Write a protein that binds this ligand. Sequence first.
Ligand SMILES: CC(=O)[C@H]1CC[C@H]2[C@@H]3CCC4=CC(=O)CC[C@]4(C)[C@H]3CC[C@]12C
Length: 251
Amino acid sequence: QLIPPLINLLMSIEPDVIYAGHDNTKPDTSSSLLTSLNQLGERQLLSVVKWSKSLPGFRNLHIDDQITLIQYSWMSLMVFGLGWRSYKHVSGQMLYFAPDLILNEQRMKESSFYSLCLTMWQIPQEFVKLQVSQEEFLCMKVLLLLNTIPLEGLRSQTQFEEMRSSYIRELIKAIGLRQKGVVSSSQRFYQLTKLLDNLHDLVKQLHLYCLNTFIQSRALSVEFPEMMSEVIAAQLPKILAGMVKPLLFHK
Ligand SMILES: CC(=O)[C@H]1CC[C@H]2[C@@H]3CCC4=CC(=O)CC[C@]4(C)[C@H]3CC[C@]12C
């Protein structure tokens, strides 16, 4: 009725919650924790690719572009999802990685990892502050998938532009569901798109921590599964070096 068709479709294709398959019964060490988060990441990566095959318009981009967009955005999509689950299930007061892997301050012993968690915590915090709706979150997540492209652009750049515009228009409709004011809705659009822009710097810290841990994996006793190892090796160094074009809503 009032909920736009595309938004209902996005709600319908959102994956079912993913479990980390984490022990719990045993004392979590820093390395065991990271290993468990990587196992969760491997399971979420599969989920992300399956989700993308049902995402309107995505399957129509050139296959190389589809692969490139997933390899550029997996970290962003996953931390954004973490933000949403944390917001929804624990009022943003704990990091809800999975139902069997919820982290609070007490479990973040490692000072470097705790610092990374505080960075991640910024998202649920903004979600709480802005009171982001399920409808807004769904459209913003798609925009994140489409938020970075190669320096030379995509093979299906035209199709990509149209897709991105369609989802920007859908985010506007989501905002309109609760933002009556023409300026209030406008200021809302500004706030939400500014949040997406800010994710770029946030994700960069996650990318750096990941690539470092990946290179020191044997030394840190941290295991990375095969699919995650592939995306890291295929693009992280390039992304970190800034050899990609981040798309920004605000100059
Ligand atoms: C092991 C490691 O370096 C950590 C640092 C940042 C961590 C990621 C942070 C974001 C994230 C959220 C999830 O819900 C799944 C796991 C992932 C994808 C995490 C997997 C483990 C990572 C990559």
